[PDB]
């Protein structure tokens, strides 16, 4: 991995290949590791970059423990600028990664050549859309959350295995556990749970997400929507997937998987993203 | 103790006596407990209020783990407004409590009848000014701080006993460690170490503290400076105590103690504050 100072911390990142950039943004509680089997379908047709968000993966931590969505936006902005990823960017995004990439395309659309997204935060959430996850996420946003996320590491020990159809090896789980050895190291996972805009709160993230939803639903940026079956956030019959399916200049591809679909169908995801990237580069 | 909702958390506070308000503000890593033997010298001549800052004492925690100085400013502002402590207020402040009270004085001087302060943050600091705390406070502002503050709870187990001349009882230490049973509960103590403006950094805190320093050094608000012998932040020979003695309309008293002087001379402190308060109310 490479590494670069960002603000008061340091961000590690995968950087393999040549050409126009293809940026892979992970979510909670994962890292660039999640993309390991998808990137090889792309590293001969583009410069693949996959950063670990601050406090996650192999990256540095926030010395002020500033782990809100706004903080991650600032850290990732600093990373884009430091590395020079400002022209003809294909974003490949998932979970909070989508929120970060969507927001970036909102503010710098001239820099974005295309967006491929999966189980994404496409608009502010409602509790109905959480379906199977509603009791857990609700509890994480009450005072129980400190125990569940920090003392019990629930995202790594339960959400990750729950969100994969196949059985993870012990080495895979060891990799996912590596950034989070102590309760005081797991604050980013709790914050990501508490930052989700659900029916108005938190109001600042709700505003940012509403803004990029309003923009992307009218933006002619080329898009690939990868839908997992049965999926999680974006699922058949759900209001959020319906909204995503309204977006313009968009193609859709279906693959097998739950929330962490990369662990179940990486080759199909990589093949779809590769067709997309070639198509997008054709019209530059 | 009383308790009131403030922003997204809840603040516990002592509220005893009646009449014009006298507000006692503690710093790192203490709580209103620090004033327990000072308030009885005042509660027959004023409404004494002593809030525990968010994440400390008996108060609720910050669900987003937002523990910077500006966050505490917002939470304490919400307390001031909810309890309506906005007229004829005498501030009795110490350590980071002083920064908060000073900053309140800066923005709403019409609400402030007088300020009694001890071992306070009167202006941005220099590393020399730290004297024998310099090794600790340098280390905490490096990557070792997480181990020292979160894993070892250095501020409660070491800094508090080291800042009192007498030996603290078992019950006293049991109280002081009550908010901090786990590493993930100790984030406020580390944030407080990292937020001190030292030689320009952090720059936002430095701007705030410089602003209230410029203001208070020229303000005619009545002041009582309680100087501890030998003290810690405000010591003989130091530039910070010299600047503090620059401040107008001020009376100075001396008592025995180190940083946590309330634990060694609470009756002297209480008598000085009571005298100051009665004078302030007589002139108002």
Author numbering:
A (entry chain A), B (entry chain B): 1 to 284
Give passages from the manuscript:
Haloalkane dehalogenases (HLDs) are α/β-hydrolase fold enzymes that catalyse the cleavage of carbon–halogen bonds in halogenated compounds through an SN2 nucleophilic substitution mechanism, producing a corresponding alcohol, a halide and a proton. Recently, database-mining searches identified a new haloalkane dehalogenase, DmmarA, encoded in the genome of the waterborne pathogenic bacterium Mycobacterium marinum M. This bacterium causes a tuberculosis-like illness in fish and can lead to infections in humans, particularly those with immune deficiencies. However, DmmarA differs from the other members of the HLD-II subfamily as it contains an aspartic acid instead of a glutamic acid as the catalytic acid in the catalytic triad.
Crystallization screening and subsequent crystal-growth optimization identified two chemical conditions, at pH 6.5 and pH 5.5, where we could reproducibly obtain DmmarA crystals. This crystal structure was solved to a resolution of 1.85 Å in space group P1211, with unit-cell parameters a = 91.816, b = 61.381, c = 106.689 Å, α = 90, β = 106.256, γ = 90°. The Matthews Probability Calculator suggested four DmmarA (∼33 000 Da) molecules in the asymmetric unit and these were identified in molecular-replacement searches. In the active site we find the proton-relay catalytic triad, which is atypically composed of a nucleophilic aspartate (Asp95), a base histidine (His259) and a catalytic acid (Asp119). Careful inspection of the electron-density maps revealed an atypical mode of DmmarA homodimerization that has not previously been observed. Precisely, the DmmarA structure displays a new so-called back-to-back homodimerization mode, distinguishing it from the previously described HLD dimers. The DmmarA homodimer is assembled due to noncovalent interactions between the L5 loop located in the main α/β-core, the α5′ and α7 helices in the cap domain of one chain and the corresponding symmetric interface of the second chain. Our crystallographic analysis, supported by nanoDSF and SAXS experiments, provides evidence that the DmmarA enzyme forms symmetric homodimers, predominantly due to the specific composition and conformation of the L5 loop.
